[PDB]
């Protein structure tokens, strides 16, 4: 009975130290998964046999430590790959190779334990796909786990693994992290390779980033050191750090110019008071730490007109993704293979011209510029809530096949919009953004606090995150699912 609440670094040490065996840790983890996962449906594709095989051969700073992979974008050789598409799940399709991410983790000593749930093609901010069923929150089984990397977020929150992979296009790593009370990082655009495959139309024109889940800031730093770097064909790239993140995390950044946002600058909905208060509390802690904290934010955040352009790009991305998956199994996918919301985008995609698509991408670049100018002006970090509302109940965000969306993502309207309004701007700017599990709602649901740093500055981000982790430690808290 190993203490699975220890982070990856600690679990790696227990093995290295010899205090516990690789098979002990793995088997202890597998047992825990078999007992807890049925209740939350986080891990949809178990890979225990592979995990056991890799465990014997594993070597590195994290040899023997298990990890979970989202069933989207990145793939593992010879394993089921559904992307939560009904037609794909039924085909029994299996990937033919390892994504660079997977190779890097294995070389580091990690053992692939399985794949986590996600909405179809990661097209929702909740994880309730028709193909695998809903993933439930370890903190409250009747609540959503956010999305699209909801499976990985819940898995880490329930200790099914100390760390996990996920991707973020509108906040898909940060959102589930906030909702599930774990640390979720969307690094600088181009930091982590999603290759060798080229998916989602150049990863949604760069808006889609591979990201990381963990329960400690040091685990994130170590993960970055493992999966970062330019790989062949990678479209985007990030500025190079001078030293490994595992090392720089303890450096003192000194007093930084910090801006705090505790209201919705767009003014189209009220920021939940509890979400705002969590960010406010974090800002206060930073002020006590000696940082120059002020109420300020990039003026560009007051405008979300770019989301329309982003939606158009997403329509094309999903449409072509449906095509790519069809080619994988050898037959075109039909309206009967995917969810209605996904097929809707296929229709909309047909109305998009080449010039229109190009114009939408330019809109993203221009908005990214307006956002980054705030940091250019001297500001170092922006602190704001990761999400803007209380966590929705299961079934709340999934719309009936008869809903009148009308020319726009279902995740970009009403209840879903409030989940991603404070995260999507940074998918566009490409700046590193991390969600820290610093808050809790009055009814016991995790509330994440987001920190955003300048393009390429994960070093400063992790440094300040480590400071907040020390000032407002969250490790003491555990979901009810774990008693």
Q: Is the peptide bond before 182 cis (omega within 30 degrees of 0)?
A: no
Of 84, 152, 172, 228, catalytic = 172
Distance, in Å, from the CA atom of 288 to the CA atom of 195, rounded to the nearest integer, reads 42
All residues at 6 or more sequence positions from 2 whose CB lies less than 8 Å from its CB, including other chains:
11, 14, 20, 24, 25, 28, 29
Specify whether the CB–CB gap between 208 and 167 falls below 8 A.
yes
Query: Residue 82, Cα to own-chain centre: how many angstroms?
Result: 18
Distance, in Å, from the CA atom of 160 to the CA atom of 136, rounded to the nearest integer, reads 14
Nearest residue to 13 via CA among 186, 199, 277, 216: 216
Specify whether the CB–CB gap between 438 and 282 falls below 8 A.
yes
Nearest residue to 172 via CA among 76, 296, 84, 292: 84
List phi, psi (to 5°) of 261: -120, 115
Helix (H, G, I), strand (E, B) or coil at 63: coil
Specify whether the CB–CB gap between 135 and 117 falls below 8 A.
yes
The one-character DSSP state at 239 is P
Q: Domains of the chain by range and CATH?
A: 1-483 (3.90.1300.10)
Of 70, 86, 89, 186, catalytic = 70
What secondary structure, in 3-state letters, does 135-162 show?
A: CCECCECCECCCCCCHHHHHHHHCCCCC
The DSSP H or E segment spanning 294 is strand 292-295
Residue matched to tokens 């889940």? 213
Helix (H, G, I), strand (E, B) or coil at 116: strand
Nearest residue to 155 via CA among 115, 103, 194, 126: 115
Of 76, 84, 91, 148, catalytic = 148
Helix (H, G, I), strand (E, B) or coil at 254: coil
Assess whether 148 carries a catalytic annotation: yes
Distance, in Å, from the CA atom of 13 to the CA atom of 68, rounded to the nearest integer, reads 19
What secondary structure, in 3-state letters, does 407-444 show?
A: CCCHHHCHHHHHHHCCCCHHHHHCCCEEEEEEEECCCC
Class of residue 360 by CB neighbours under 10 A (exposed 0-12, middle 13-18, buried 19+): buried
Distances from the Cα of 204 to the Cαs of 169, 173, 257, 317, 357, in angstroms?
A: 8, 15, 32, 6, 11
Assess whether 201 carries a catalytic annotation: no
- 143 - beta bridge partners? 393
Specify whether the CB–CB gap between 110 and 25 falls below 8 A.
no
Diameter of the chain measured on Cα atoms: 61
Distance, in Å, from the CA atom of 241 to the CA atom of 452, rounded to the nearest integer, reads 17
Residue matched to tokens 């170590």? 222
All residues at 6 or more sequence positions from 48 whose CB lies less than 8 Å from its CB, including other chains:
30, 113, 114
Assess whether 347 carries a catalytic annotation: no
Tell me, in Å, the resolution of the deposited structure: 1.9
Query: Residue 258, Cα to own-chain centre: how many angstroms?
Result: 24
Where helices occur in 262-353 by DSSP H, the ranges are 273-288, 306-329, 340-349
Distance, in Å, from the CA atom of 133 to the CA atom of 57, rounded to the nearest integer, reads 34
Determine how β-strand 163-168 pairs with β-strand 66-70.
Answer: parallel
Q: Give the chain's length.
A: 483
Class of residue 473 by CB neighbours under 10 A (exposed 0-12, middle 13-18, buried 19+): exposed
């Amino acid at each position: 009975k190993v203490d699975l609440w220890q982070d990856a670094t600690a679990q790696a040490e227990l093995v290295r130290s010899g205090e516990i065996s690789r098979t002990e840790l793995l088997e202890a983890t597998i047992a825990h998964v078999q007992a807890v996962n049925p209740e939350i449906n986080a891990v949809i594709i178990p890979l225990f046999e592979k995990a056991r095989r890799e465990s014997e051969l594993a070597s590195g700073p994290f040899a023997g430590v298990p990890y979970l992979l989202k069933d989207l974008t990145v793939v593992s050789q010879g394993d089921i790959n559904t992307s939560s598409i009904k037609g794909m799940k039924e085909s029994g399709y299996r990937a033919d190779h390892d994504a660079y991410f997977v190779q890097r983790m294995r070389a580091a000593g990690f053992v692939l334990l399985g794949k986590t749930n996600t909405p179809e093609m990661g097209n929702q901010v909740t994880t309730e796909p028709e193909a695998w069923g809903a993933t439930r929150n370890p903190w409250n089984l009747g609540r959503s786990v956010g999305g699209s990397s909801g499976g990985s977020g819940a898995a880490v929150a329930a200790a099914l693994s100390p760390v996990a992979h996920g991707n973020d296009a509108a906040g898909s790593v940060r959102i589930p992290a906030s909702v599930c009370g774990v640390v979720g990082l969307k690094p600088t655009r181009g930091r982590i390779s999603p290759g060798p495959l080229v998916t989602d139309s150049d990863n949604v024109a760069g808006a889609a980033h591979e990201g990381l889940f963990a329960r400690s800031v040091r685990d994130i730093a170590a993960l970055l050191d493992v999966v970062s770097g330019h790989r062949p064909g990678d479209t985007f790239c990030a500025p190079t750090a001078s030293r490994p993140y595992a090392q720089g995390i303890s450096e003192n950044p000194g007093s930084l110019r910090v801006g705090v946002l505790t209201h919705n600058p767009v003014g189209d909905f009220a920021l939940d008071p509890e979400c705002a208060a969590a960010a406010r509390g974090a800002a206060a802690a930073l002020a006590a730490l000696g940082h120059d904290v002020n109420d300020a934010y990039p003026e560009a955040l007051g405008d979300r007109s770019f989301l329309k352009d982003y939606s158009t790009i997403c329509d094309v991305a999903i449409a072509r993704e449906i095509e790519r998956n069809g080619e994988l199994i050898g037959r075109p996918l039909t309206e009967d293979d995917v969810e209605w919301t996904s097929w809707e985008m296929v229709k909309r995609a047909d109305q998009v011209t080449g010039r229109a698509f190009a114009a939408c991408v330019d809109e993203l670049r221009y908005y990214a510029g307006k956002v980054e100018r705030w940091w250019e002006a001297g500001w170092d970090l922006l602190i704001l809530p990761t999400v803007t509302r209380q966590t929705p109940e299961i079934g709340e965000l999934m719309l009936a096949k008869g809903t009148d969306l009308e020319g726009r993502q279902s995740a970009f309207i009403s209840g879903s919009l409030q989940m991603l309004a404070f995260t999507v701007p940074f998918n566009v700017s490409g700046q590193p953004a991390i969600s820290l599990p610093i808050g809790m709602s009055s009814d016991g649901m995790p509330i994440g606090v987001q920190i955003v740093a300048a393009y390429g500055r994960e070093d400063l981000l992790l440094q300040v995150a480590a400071q907040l982790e020390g000032a407002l430690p969250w490790v003491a808290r555990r979901p009810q699912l774990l008693n």
